[PDB]
Amino acid sequence: HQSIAQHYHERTKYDPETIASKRLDWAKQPVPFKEYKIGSAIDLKPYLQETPDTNGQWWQRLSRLLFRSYGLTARMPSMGNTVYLRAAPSAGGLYPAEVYVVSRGTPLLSPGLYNYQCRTHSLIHYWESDVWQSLQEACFWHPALESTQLAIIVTAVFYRSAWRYEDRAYRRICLDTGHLLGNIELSAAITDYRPHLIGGFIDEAVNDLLYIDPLQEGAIAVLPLADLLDIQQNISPGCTALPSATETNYPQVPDGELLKYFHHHTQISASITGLEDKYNFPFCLKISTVSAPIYWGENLSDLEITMHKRRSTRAYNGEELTFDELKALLDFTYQPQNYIDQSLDNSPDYFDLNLIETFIAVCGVQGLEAGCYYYAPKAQELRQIRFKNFRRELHFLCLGQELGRDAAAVIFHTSDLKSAIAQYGDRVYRYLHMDAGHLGQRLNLAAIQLNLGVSGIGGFFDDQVNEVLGIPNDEAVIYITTLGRPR
Ligand SMILES: Cc1cc2nc3c(=O)[nH]c(=O)nc-3n(C[C@H](O)[C@H](O)[C@H](O)COP(=O)(O)O)c2cc1C
Ligand SMILES: [Ca+2]
Ligand SMILES: [Cl-]
Ligand SMILES: [Cl-]
Structure with missing residues (x-):
């Protein structure tokens, strides 16, 4: 079966x-950016520059890594408005992926949660608390988290693609996300970072950690960022993927309901044993x-x-x-x-x-x-x-x-x-x-x-x-x- x-x-x-x-519901075409009413904005633009401070050199690396990964690189005209094209391509120009940065808490980067704002090339620090251990538990204590001080998490805002592709959007969302992952590894190389890909994690836990609505958005990749200028972060690549269950007893799922059903039926859960x-x-x-x-x-x-x-x-x-x-x-x-x-x-x-x-x-x-x-x-x-x-x-x-x-x-x-x-x-x-x-x-x-x-x-x-x-x-x-x- x-x-x-x-x-x-x-x-x-x-x-x-x-x-x-x-027929597309234009009244509902999504705005492919997230809004935050609460949090501090960190402007990364001053560090996306030329020459001529070690703290500034660090911010330049993060600014460049993010910009080359998912920054806005062009604009188009479209039905009386502008679509902003990005470093990563996306089926339909829909941009289902969202980039977050998780900080362990360093002398330069306060702990907690940050959302990457493509529109302004900024980070919105929307949650300040020490969340690293929760991220470690959610990723089964993956060794890449023990050595590192920050991580990117890439989520998908489902409707951004589903608005056009309906249930077929899940293929496009994952492809779009893969393109972004390719930029992250290349952008990281440019900035002396190495991402460690973590596909095996407890979805419920990661989504809770980010404080996102799992019916609307879900984490699909966790990537600790190893600073290759720190000898201690030149660690071995690790387990990038873990298995989920195989479900053969699925019910009849009506068209339009299959994408979310599928996402919620491909999760990983805490281990009964180890x-x-x-x-x-x-x-x-x-x-x-x-x-x-x-x-x-x-x-x-x-x-x-x-x-x-x-x-x-x-x-x-x-x-x-x-x-x-x-x-x-x-x-x-x-x-x-x-x-x-x-x-x-x-x-x-x-x-x-x-x-x-x-x-x-x-x-x-x-x-x-x-x-x-x-x-x-x-x-x-x-x-x-x-x-x-x-x-x-x-x-x-x-x-x-x-x-x-x-x-x-x-x-x-x-x-x-x-x-x-x-x-x-x-x-x-x-x-x-x-x-x-x-x-x-x-x-x-x-x-x-x-x-x-x-x-x-x-x-x-x-x-x-x-x-x-x-x-x-x-x-x-x-x-x-x-x-x-x-x-
Ligand atoms: C998974 C995926 C599927 C795509 N499918 C098509 C397609 O069938 N036809 C096409 O003309 N462009 C396709 N594209 C290109 C997108 O239309 C394009 O990435 C988007 O308009 C943004 O433009 P940019 O890639 O120049 O930044 C696809 C891109 C992705 C990543
Ligand atoms: Ca095209
Ligand atoms: Cl042959
Ligand atoms: Cl807070």
Whole structure:
């Protein structure tokens, strides 16, 4: 019998037979920022600067870490108003993620709870008390909390995405959040911090600790921030993910009620007690993807510029990528060990990349036949599984978007959901989508650094993808990332 994550997935697919048979409540379009009536505001803008104090140097690092992670980087006009685009992309420009900072209490940062205000690049200190032990208990005394003095917690304000995507919003929320997680690790590197990803925590406890309404908002990632300038905080990566239960006895949940049901049925509760790529394709054509690394400038200066200017490309011109360009994108995304000499982490935390497979539809990469390839990141190989021009198909698969038709290459992240659930329970659904978004952000940043076009695609004809591209039946497509040359 299917578990609730499989049911959720099935219920949120798009089907060409029914997509036409499926009105936004504008009176209700959410404002994607939180308001606080009580608390001290800490303005971070004075520290987002140039040159020419050790306390100021500390605030500059926190200010920059937050700004490069989730700061406002552009504005658009929209129905008589302005949408502010951010460092992290978001399905529909809806921004379900909220960033909090939790302080253990240091001589510079009072203890308690802080909300990151994108609009003003400030922190609102809305609760001053020592909350660290409560956070430790909620995360099963994770060792990363013992060494550190502050943590980011990322939550999702469900309605921000559900307003548009209804129950399908849970996929988009987790993807959006994964993109933000990718910025956090890169932004941290820039500022000599390392985040320690904690996906395994007692939801009830974390949500209580933040004083948020769990029907409207819920924590999905806890990230202690280790200060790499403190020898004592250069700690080993730890357990990034824990299992939830597997629920097979779910009731019939009406449309519109499934997203919250699913979030509340993927929680973790207090305890009662206490190296080969997956698909060998041995008789298929294999092509090495070994690449020289992307150069990010002195002291990651070009990574900073790229993070600031990064936008999702509206349209492609249909021109080709070079194979070197494709290899460089894959290298930065999947081979972080090749960036240690540029001060990036050789192994940034994910929940579990072993659960995610990568397939690439290639339509316009010079030196590569058009078709579908399995990407084997451990071996650093593309293995050709189909030989065909897939432009027309990809156009359809991406819900009719020209981005799919005109892309040079389209990267599909997939997962065998049954197997994933067997390991981490239904909560693995969160982990998969956050990991795919994290990979996605690395791909987006690499593309922009290389003067290429890129855009995620959240909605697609789920079942039809495998059929067209030759992706093994057991692999459910989780996310799509298009790559091309900008129009
Ligand atoms: C999970 C996710 C799904 C997305 N789906 C699409 C999509 O199908 N089509 C599209 O044109 N852009 C898509 N995007 C891009 C968003 O529209 C974009 O991130 C948002 O408008 C903000 O713009 P920015 O990325 O330039 O900051 C997606 C982005 C995310 C992160
Ligand atoms: Ca777009
Ligand atoms: Cl207080
Ligand atoms: Cl084979």
